[PDB]
Amino acid sequence: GAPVPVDENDEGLQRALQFAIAEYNRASNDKYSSRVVRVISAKRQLVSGIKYILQVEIGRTTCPKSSGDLQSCEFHDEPELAKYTTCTFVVYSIPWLNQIKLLESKCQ
Template identity: 30%
Template sequence: MFWKLPLLLGLLALGPHVRSWIFEEVGKRGKQFSLCVEFAVHHFNEHQLDENAYKLLWVGRSLHKKYSLIYLMDLNLGRTICRKHDEDIDNCPLQEGPEGKKVNCTFIVDSRPWFTQFTLLNSTCQQT
């Protein structure tokens, strides 16, 4: 039992560096990553009380958990003049003035492409 203590202390000391072993950069234009981004934006819109839709402005971090299909992404979203159930939100103009809100979000999405299934594991958003 006591022989495990040095191992545990070593892992705790390496804590901040372990994340770099777990996640690695992934191309922002990859098909699976793009599908996860689309799912995250859709999920954000569906769970907002706001009737207006938000659309993707840009992608910040794009990471992939090694040996899995879990993606971590930082997305910047902008509030549009369209309603969230309109068909073509990507081509909808952004709202201007005080109504023109922008949000920075971090999403962690687990994907199962063979089932076309996505699961939001975590999300945090902050209005800018």
């Protein structure tokens, strides 16, 4: 057995970053929103089911949710002031039972 990396065509891995990341935005939703930036390690271990280990230097997005913006939101109008954080997402994905669940998703 071993770890298998994903490509730009794995709706499963996409549901992984969107699951944990979705939790990052709902976490900072207060001040503003947290948005991915430059992934680093997006993989899906393959055991009895799957393990989704993700890494990305999370970033932010000024606008919160409405702020009279309809649909936009953005980091800090540039990189010059949009630091980031290193977060890892751990999503177990089990086929045959469409059972996806979050696990080790922590950012810091």
